[PDB]
Amino acid sequence: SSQIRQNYSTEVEAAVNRLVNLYLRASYTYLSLGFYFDRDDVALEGVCHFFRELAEEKREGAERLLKMQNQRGGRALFQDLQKPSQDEWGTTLDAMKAAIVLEKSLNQALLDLHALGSAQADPHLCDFLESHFLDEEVKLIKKMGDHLTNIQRLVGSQAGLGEYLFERLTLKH
Amino acid sequence: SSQIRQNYSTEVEAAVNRLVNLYLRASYTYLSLGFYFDRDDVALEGVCHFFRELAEEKREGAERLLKMQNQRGGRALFQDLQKPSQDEWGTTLDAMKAAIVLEKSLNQALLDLHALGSAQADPHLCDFLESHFLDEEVKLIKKMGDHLTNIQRLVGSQAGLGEYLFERLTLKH
Amino acid sequence: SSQIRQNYSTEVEAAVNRLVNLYLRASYTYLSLGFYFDRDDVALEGVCHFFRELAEEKREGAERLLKMQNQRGGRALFQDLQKPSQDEWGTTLDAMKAAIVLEKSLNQALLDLHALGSAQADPHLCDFLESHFLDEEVKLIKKMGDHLTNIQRLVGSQAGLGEYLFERLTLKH
Amino acid sequence: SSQIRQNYSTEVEAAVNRLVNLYLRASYTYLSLGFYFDRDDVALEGVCHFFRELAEEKREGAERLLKMQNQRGGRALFQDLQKPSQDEWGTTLDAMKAAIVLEKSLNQALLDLHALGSAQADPHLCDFLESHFLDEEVKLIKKMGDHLTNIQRLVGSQAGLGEYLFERLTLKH
Ligand SMILES: [Cl-]
Ligand SMILES: [Cl-]
Ligand SMILES: [Cl-]
Ligand SMILES: [Cl-]
């Protein structure tokens, strides 16, 4: 058992474990999104790359939470990981809408844990989220919003042409 | 009071202060244009960058006028700065039309001050405008005209697609 | 309209627009202070430089707020900018007193927005101010206080001599 | 005789010769000022250097006028050079006042030649003065005005101390 734990509530400890699960679920969703866009009948390499990168980012977020759990003397507990919500993800527009919904759900979980930390007077937890998660999440959601607007502008007419152009001229590939 | 002032009319001194106001107003207009194109629901980064760069250029023009005012022994006087004429700027085409109108108004103010300087036999003022402002303004207006033509060619059909292509393939981003 | 806005109150959105106005007003005040010290009948280059640098810093603060407004899905709205409170700024001592008063007013606006963000449970806003504004402001006010003390020590007797020495041996020039 | 002269009036030709005389007279005045401040009983090295540099600058201005006279097919004619107006130049304040008076007289001669060139429709002459003389003269007069203000601030009380400090901390030495 821990000899280090101080000012670290059981409520926070549990919520951190739940948030690890949510990040790993998000990572898995992005893995599925990435490989869908690598299908020969979809074949949008830049979109594939975008989602593969996000799978890595979310895995890293979970690892940072687990590191923090140990630094505070909490105990990591892992649960089953639910499969992603879809097996096929539609168009780039459909996929980017699904990604924004996912990110808003993660952001809300961050905000809820921040509020719990505030209520429990756990400034280390609050700072940790502020420093490593909240701004990263706002920046990502802004980037996704920008992408959504551009995809919408392009597929309004000539959907196929528009989807190709976005992948070629906006996304990294 | 000044021990240096020579051949520097009160009329020119006042007109220079007015021109500083007009440049700072233009800078502010460009700031608003730049941030409008950074909105998540507009999201045209190259257009944002173009107008942000012009905000800087116009601020620098005002600073050069203020430096000159002091070099001649005139006295800088600042007035309120009017907010820009719009809060939302429409499409890239709408924005570039508004920018050309603005630039023509600045160019006319330059020409009017040049004529005043000529009438007052103030060759330093005339040279100063020739050397630092008049050609810069002609070059800018030509660039904006070129852009306008290209945007017009593109949005004639497929307005969304055209606006994206211009931002991606003409503007710096 | 925004597809990204989350946990971002209308009250905060408005207060951020007001704070942009206050920063741009401060920038304008510093521009006037800088050019006053460049007058041939004032001629304190280090003092000019000090205030010109602050005009840039305050403009950059406003730009960071506007960037943040867009990242959160708020809408930038610009108002008229009031001219500075004086047309002539007196001695270096008078100017540095006026600057401290200005900075304390900006600091109070930061603190008030922080308190609003706390009350609205907007940790991203609170963190943003903590990370980019509050410490910068404390450091600046301390520097100005240090300067004020040194100027006071010097102009107690031999005001002209003291003002020259401060400009030459403390300020950057 | 010239095979090249075109659009170059006898009036301009003569006035250019007179202006060469005035520049060489100014150069000679600065030579005397420079060596006065090198006296063992004056001994202000930075002031000496300042005026020696101006003697060179004025000689170079005369050489540029003579080059231009030949480029236009006019004929250089030299007259006697009057000695400087004083044999001893007083304090740094006295000397810098005398220098500003001299420079204003040169500036007025430039402006008068510009007006003659305008009246004679000689744009090459007008451009030549604009490009090589008028702005240089405005910048110099501003620098001298700045110096005068600083010297005045310093010698108001403790004249000896003030004169030393100006030489040590403003002038190049
Ligand atoms: Cl199980
Ligand atoms: Cl007013
Ligand atoms: Cl209004
Ligand atoms: Cl003779």
Side-chain angles (χ1 to χ4, degrees), chain D residues 53-107:
Chain D
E53 165 71 12
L54 285 173
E56 169 182 41
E57 291 182 12
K58 294 311 183 192
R59 166 182 64 79
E60 290 173 352
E63 289 171 351
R64 189 183 301 263
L65 289 161
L66 288 167
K67 180 177 182 186
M68 183 269 291
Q69 178 82 291
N70 280 346
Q71 287 171 322
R72 293 299 301 272
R75 290 298 178 251
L77 284 181
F78 295 97
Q79 303 297 154
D80 301 325
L81 287 177
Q82 292 157 245
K83 67 178 195 183
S85 64
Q86 302 181 26
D87 299 319
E88 295 186 315
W89 298 97
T91 67
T92 302
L93 181 59
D94 295 325
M96 198 67 62
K97 286 181 176 182
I100 287 169
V101 164
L102 177 54
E103 289 303 325
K104 287 173 167 180
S105 79
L106 291 180
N107 199 37

Coordinates of all heavy atoms in Angstrom, one line a residue, chain D residues 53-107:
Chain D
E53 N 33.6 64.9 -37.6 CA 32.7 64.1 -38.4 C 31.9 65.0 -39.3 O 31.7 64.7 -40.5 CB 31.8 63.1 -37.7 CG 30.7 62.5 -38.5 CD 31.2 61.5 -39.5 OE1 32.3 61.1 -39.5 OE2 30.4 61.2 -40.4
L54 N 31.3 66.1 -38.8 CA 30.5 67.0 -39.6 C 31.3 67.7 -40.6 O 30.9 68.0 -41.7 CB 29.7 68.0 -38.7 CG 28.5 67.3 -38.0 CD1 27.9 68.3 -37.0 CD2 27.5 66.9 -39.0
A55 N 32.6 68.0 -40.3 CA 33.4 68.7 -41.3 C 33.6 67.8 -42.5 O 33.5 68.2 -43.6 CB 34.8 69.0 -40.7
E56 N 33.8 66.5 -42.2 CA 33.9 65.5 -43.3 C 32.6 65.5 -44.1 O 32.7 65.4 -45.4 CB 34.4 64.1 -42.8 CG 34.3 63.0 -43.8 CD 34.6 61.6 -43.4 OE1 34.3 61.1 -42.3 OE2 35.2 60.9 -44.3
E57 N 31.5 65.4 -43.4 CA 30.2 65.2 -44.1 C 29.9 66.4 -45.0 O 29.4 66.3 -46.1 CB 29.0 65.1 -43.1 CG 29.1 63.7 -42.4 CD 27.9 63.5 -41.5 OE1 26.9 64.2 -41.5 OE2 28.1 62.5 -40.7
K58 N 30.3 67.6 -44.6 CA 30.0 68.8 -45.4 C 30.9 68.8 -46.6 O 30.5 69.3 -47.7 CB 30.1 70.0 -44.6 CG 29.0 70.2 -43.5 CD 27.7 69.9 -43.9 CE 26.6 70.1 -42.9 NZ 25.3 69.6 -43.3
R59 N 32.2 68.4 -46.4 CA 33.1 68.3 -47.6 C 32.6 67.4 -48.6 O 32.6 67.6 -49.8 CB 34.5 67.9 -47.1 CG 35.4 67.4 -48.3 CD 36.8 67.0 -47.9 NE 36.7 65.8 -47.1 CZ 36.5 64.5 -47.6 NH1 36.3 64.3 -48.9 NH2 36.4 63.5 -46.7
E60 N 32.0 66.2 -48.1 CA 31.5 65.2 -49.0 C 30.3 65.7 -49.8 O 30.1 65.5 -51.0 CB 31.2 63.9 -48.3 CG 32.4 63.2 -47.8 CD 32.1 62.0 -46.9 OE1 31.0 61.8 -46.5 OE2 33.1 61.4 -46.5
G61 N 29.5 66.6 -49.1 CA 28.3 67.2 -49.8 C 28.8 68.1 -50.9 O 28.2 68.1 -52.0
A62 N 29.8 68.9 -50.6 CA 30.3 69.7 -51.7 C 30.9 68.9 -52.8 O 30.6 69.3 -54.0 CB 31.4 70.6 -51.1
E63 N 31.6 67.8 -52.6 CA 32.1 67.0 -53.6 C 31.0 66.4 -54.5 O 31.1 66.3 -55.7 CB 33.0 65.9 -53.0 CG 34.3 66.6 -52.6 CD 35.2 65.7 -51.8 OE1 34.8 64.6 -51.4 OE2 36.3 66.3 -51.3
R64 N 29.8 66.0 -53.8 CA 28.7 65.4 -54.6 C 28.1 66.5 -55.5 O 27.7 66.2 -56.6 CB 27.7 64.9 -53.6 CG 26.6 64.1 -54.3 CD 25.5 63.6 -53.4 NE 26.2 62.8 -52.4 CZ 26.2 61.4 -52.4 NH1 25.7 60.8 -53.5 NH2 26.7 60.7 -51.4
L65 N 28.0 67.7 -55.0 CA 27.5 68.8 -55.8 C 28.4 69.0 -57.0 O 27.9 69.3 -58.1 CB 27.4 70.1 -55.0 CG 26.2 70.1 -54.0 CD1 26.4 71.2 -53.0 CD2 24.9 70.4 -54.7
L66 N 29.7 69.0 -56.8 CA 30.7 69.2 -57.9 C 30.6 68.1 -58.9 O 30.7 68.3 -60.2 CB 32.1 69.4 -57.3 CG 32.4 70.6 -56.6 CD1 33.7 70.5 -55.8 CD2 32.5 71.8 -57.5
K67 N 30.4 66.9 -58.5 CA 30.2 65.7 -59.4 C 29.0 66.0 -60.2 O 29.0 65.7 -61.4 CB 30.2 64.4 -58.6 CG 30.0 63.2 -59.4 CD 30.0 61.9 -58.7 CE 29.8 60.7 -59.6 NZ 29.7 59.4 -58.8
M68 N 27.9 66.4 -59.6 CA 26.7 66.6 -60.3 C 26.8 67.7 -61.3 O 26.3 67.6 -62.4 CB 25.5 66.9 -59.3 CG 24.2 67.1 -60.0 SD 23.9 68.8 -60.5 CE 23.7 69.5 -58.8
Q69 N 27.5 68.8 -61.0 CA 27.7 69.9 -61.8 C 28.3 69.4 -63.1 O 27.9 69.8 -64.3 CB 28.6 71.0 -61.1 CG 29.0 72.2 -61.9 CD 27.9 73.2 -61.9 OE1 26.8 73.0 -62.5 NE2 28.1 74.3 -61.2
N70 N 29.4 68.6 -63.0 CA 30.0 68.0 -64.2 C 29.1 67.1 -64.9 O 29.1 67.0 -66.2 CB 31.3 67.4 -63.8 CG 32.5 68.4 -63.7 OD1 32.4 69.5 -64.2 ND2 33.6 67.9 -63.2
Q71 N 28.3 66.3 -64.2 CA 27.4 65.3 -64.9 C 26.4 66.1 -65.8 O 26.0 65.6 -66.8 CB 26.6 64.5 -63.9 CG 27.5 63.5 -63.2 CD 26.7 62.8 -62.1 OE1 26.0 63.4 -61.3 NE2 26.9 61.5 -62.0
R72 N 26.0 67.3 -65.4 CA 25.0 68.1 -66.1 C 25.7 68.9 -67.2 O 25.0 69.5 -68.0 CB 24.2 68.9 -65.2 CG 23.3 68.2 -64.2 CD 22.2 67.3 -65.0 NE 21.3 68.1 -65.8 CZ 20.2 68.8 -65.4 NH1 19.9 68.8 -64.2 NH2 19.5 69.3 -66.3
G73 N 27.0 69.0 -67.2 CA 27.6 69.9 -68.2 C 27.8 71.3 -67.8 O 28.2 72.1 -68.6
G74 N 27.6 71.6 -66.5 CA 27.9 72.9 -65.9 C 29.4 73.0 -65.6 O 30.2 72.0 -65.8
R75 N 29.9 74.2 -65.2 CA 31.3 74.4 -65.0 C 31.5 74.9 -63.5 O 30.9 75.9 -63.1 CB 31.8 75.3 -66.1 CG 31.9 74.6 -67.4 CD 32.8 73.4 -67.5 NE 32.8 72.7 -68.8 CZ 32.2 71.5 -69.0 NH1 31.6 70.9 -67.9 NH2 32.1 70.9 -70.1
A76 N 32.2 74.1 -62.8 CA 32.6 74.4 -61.4 C 33.4 75.7 -61.4 O 34.4 75.8 -62.2 CB 33.4 73.3 -60.8
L77 N 33.1 76.6 -60.5 CA 33.9 77.8 -60.3 C 34.0 78.0 -58.8 O 33.0 78.0 -58.1 CB 33.1 79.0 -60.9 CG 33.2 79.2 -62.5 CD1 32.4 80.4 -62.9 CD2 34.6 79.2 -63.0
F78 N 35.2 78.2 -58.4 CA 35.5 78.3 -57.0 C 35.8 79.7 -56.6 O 36.3 80.5 -57.4 CB 36.7 77.4 -56.7 CG 36.4 75.9 -56.9 CD1 36.8 75.3 -58.0 CD2 35.6 75.2 -56.0 CE1 36.6 74.0 -58.3 CE2 35.4 73.9 -56.2 CZ 35.9 73.3 -57.3
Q79 N 35.3 80.1 -55.4 CA 35.6 81.4 -54.9 C 36.4 81.3 -53.6 O 36.5 80.2 -53.0 CB 34.3 82.2 -54.7 CG 33.5 82.3 -55.9 CD 34.1 83.1 -57.1 OE1 33.8 82.9 -58.2 NE2 35.0 84.0 -56.7
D80 N 36.9 82.4 -53.0 CA 37.5 82.4 -51.7 C 36.5 81.8 -50.7 O 35.3 82.0 -50.8 CB 37.9 83.9 -51.3 CG 38.8 84.6 -52.3 OD1 39.7 84.0 -52.9 OD2 38.7 85.8 -52.3
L81 N 37.1 81.2 -49.7 CA 36.4 80.7 -48.6 C 36.6 81.5 -47.4 O 37.7 81.7 -46.9 CB 36.8 79.2 -48.3 CG 36.4 78.2 -49.3 CD1 37.0 76.8 -48.8 CD2 34.9 78.1 -49.3
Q82 N 35.5 82.1 -46.9 CA 35.5 82.9 -45.7 C 35.9 82.1 -44.5 O 35.4 81.0 -44.3 CB 34.2 83.6 -45.4 CG 33.7 84.6 -46.3 CD 32.2 84.6 -46.2 OE1 31.5 84.2 -47.1 NE2 31.8 84.9 -44.9
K83 N 36.7 82.6 -43.6 CA 37.0 82.0 -42.3 C 35.8 81.9 -41.5 O 34.8 82.6 -41.6 CB 38.1 82.7 -41.6 CG 37.7 84.1 -41.0 CD 38.8 84.7 -40.3 CE 38.4 85.8 -39.4 NZ 39.6 86.5 -38.7
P84 N 35.8 80.9 -40.5 CA 34.7 80.8 -39.6 C 34.4 82.1 -38.8 O 35.3 82.9 -38.6 CB 35.0 79.7 -38.7 CG 36.0 78.9 -39.5 CD 36.8 79.9 -40.2
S85 N 33.2 82.2 -38.3 CA 32.7 83.4 -37.7 C 33.3 83.7 -36.3 O 33.3 84.8 -35.9 CB 31.2 83.4 -37.6 OG 30.7 82.4 -36.7
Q86 N 33.8 82.7 -35.6 CA 34.5 82.8 -34.3 C 35.8 82.1 -34.3 O 36.0 81.1 -35.1 CB 33.5 82.2 -33.2 CG 32.2 82.8 -33.2 CD 31.3 82.3 -32.2 OE1 31.7 81.8 -31.1 NE2 30.0 82.4 -32.5
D87 N 36.7 82.6 -33.4 CA 37.9 81.8 -33.2 C 37.9 80.9 -32.0 O 38.7 80.0 -31.9 CB 39.1 82.8 -33.0 CG 39.4 83.7 -34.1 OD1 39.3 83.2 -35.3 OD2 39.7 84.9 -33.9
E88 N 37.0 81.2 -31.0 CA 36.7 80.4 -29.8 C 35.2 80.2 -29.8 O 34.5 81.1 -30.1 CB 37.2 81.2 -28.6 CG 38.7 81.3 -28.6 CD 39.3 81.9 -27.3 OE1 38.7 82.9 -26.9 OE2 40.3 81.4 -26.9
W89 N 34.7 79.0 -29.4 CA 33.3 78.7 -29.5 C 32.6 78.5 -28.2 O 31.4 78.1 -28.3 CB 33.3 77.4 -30.4 CG 33.8 77.6 -31.8 CD1 35.1 77.3 -32.2 CD2 33.2 78.2 -32.9 NE1 35.2 77.7 -33.6 CE2 34.0 78.2 -34.0 CE3 31.9 78.7 -33.1 CZ2 33.7 78.7 -35.2 CZ3 31.5 79.1 -34.3 CH2 32.4 79.1 -35.4
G90 N 33.2 78.9 -27.1 CA 32.4 78.8 -25.8 C 32.2 77.4 -25.3 O 33.1 76.6 -25.3
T91 N 31.0 77.2 -24.8 CA 30.7 75.9 -24.2 C 30.1 75.0 -25.2 O 29.8 75.4 -26.3 CB 29.7 76.1 -23.0 OG1 28.4 76.6 -23.6 CG2 30.2 77.1 -22.0
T92 N 29.9 73.7 -24.8 CA 29.2 72.8 -25.7 C 27.8 73.3 -26.1 O 27.4 73.2 -27.2 CB 29.0 71.4 -25.0 OG1 30.3 70.9 -24.6 CG2 28.4 70.4 -25.9
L93 N 27.1 74.0 -25.2 CA 25.8 74.6 -25.5 C 26.0 75.7 -26.5 O 25.2 75.7 -27.5 CB 25.2 75.1 -24.2 CG 23.8 75.7 -24.4 CD1 22.8 74.8 -24.9 CD2 23.4 76.3 -23.0
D94 N 27.0 76.5 -26.4 CA 27.2 77.6 -27.3 C 27.5 77.1 -28.7 O 26.9 77.5 -29.7 CB 28.3 78.5 -26.9 CG 28.1 79.3 -25.6 OD1 27.0 79.7 -25.3 OD2 29.1 79.5 -24.9
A95 N 28.3 76.0 -28.7 CA 28.7 75.4 -30.0 C 27.6 74.7 -30.7 O 27.4 74.8 -31.9 CB 29.9 74.4 -29.7
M96 N 26.8 74.0 -30.0 CA 25.6 73.3 -30.6 C 24.6 74.3 -31.0 O 24.0 74.0 -32.1 CB 25.0 72.3 -29.6 CG 24.2 71.3 -30.2 SD 25.1 70.1 -31.2 CE 26.1 69.3 -30.0
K97 N 24.4 75.4 -30.4 CA 23.5 76.5 -30.9 C 24.0 77.0 -32.2 O 23.3 77.2 -33.2 CB 23.3 77.6 -29.9 CG 22.4 77.2 -28.7 CD 22.3 78.3 -27.7 CE 21.4 78.0 -26.6 NZ 21.3 79.2 -25.7
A98 N 25.3 77.3 -32.2 CA 25.9 77.8 -33.5 C 25.8 76.8 -34.6 O 25.6 77.2 -35.8 CB 27.4 78.2 -33.2
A99 N 26.0 75.5 -34.3 CA 25.8 74.5 -35.3 C 24.4 74.4 -35.9 O 24.2 74.3 -37.1 CB 26.2 73.1 -34.8
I100 N 23.4 74.5 -35.1 CA 22.0 74.5 -35.5 C 21.7 75.7 -36.4 O 21.0 75.5 -37.4 CB 21.0 74.4 -34.3 CG1 21.1 73.0 -33.7 CG2 19.6 74.7 -34.8 CD1 20.4 72.9 -32.4
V101 N 22.2 76.8 -36.0 CA 22.0 78.1 -36.8 C 22.6 77.8 -38.2 O 22.1 78.2 -39.3 CB 22.6 79.3 -36.1 CG1 22.7 80.5 -37.1 CG2 21.7 79.7 -34.9
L102 N 23.9 77.3 -38.2 CA 24.6 77.0 -39.5 C 23.7 76.0 -40.4 O 23.6 76.2 -41.6 CB 25.9 76.4 -39.2 CG 26.8 76.0 -40.3 CD1 27.0 77.1 -41.4 CD2 28.2 75.5 -39.8
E103 N 23.3 74.9 -39.7 CA 22.5 73.9 -40.5 C 21.2 74.5 -41.0 O 20.9 74.1 -42.1 CB 22.3 72.7 -39.6 CG 23.5 71.9 -39.3 CD 24.3 71.4 -40.5 OE1 23.7 71.1 -41.6 OE2 25.5 71.4 -40.5
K104 N 20.5 75.3 -40.3 CA 19.3 75.9 -40.8 C 19.6 76.8 -42.0 O 18.8 76.9 -42.9 CB 18.6 76.7 -39.7 CG 17.9 75.8 -38.7 CD 17.3 76.7 -37.6 CE 16.4 75.9 -36.7 NZ 15.9 76.8 -35.6
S105 N 20.8 77.5 -42.0 CA 21.1 78.3 -43.1 C 21.4 77.4 -44.3 O 21.0 77.8 -45.4 CB 22.3 79.3 -42.8 OG 23.5 78.6 -42.8
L106 N 22.1 76.3 -44.2 CA 22.3 75.4 -45.3 C 21.0 74.8 -45.8 O 20.8 74.7 -47.0 CB 23.3 74.2 -44.9 CG 24.7 74.6 -44.6 CD1 25.5 73.3 -44.2 CD2 25.4 75.1 -45.8
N107 N 20.1 74.5 -44.9 CA 18.8 73.9 -45.2 C 18.0 74.9 -46.1 O 17.4 74.6 -47.1 CB 18.0 73.5 -44.0 CG 16.9 72.5 -44.4 OD1 17.1 71.6 -45.2 ND2 15.9 72.6 -43.6

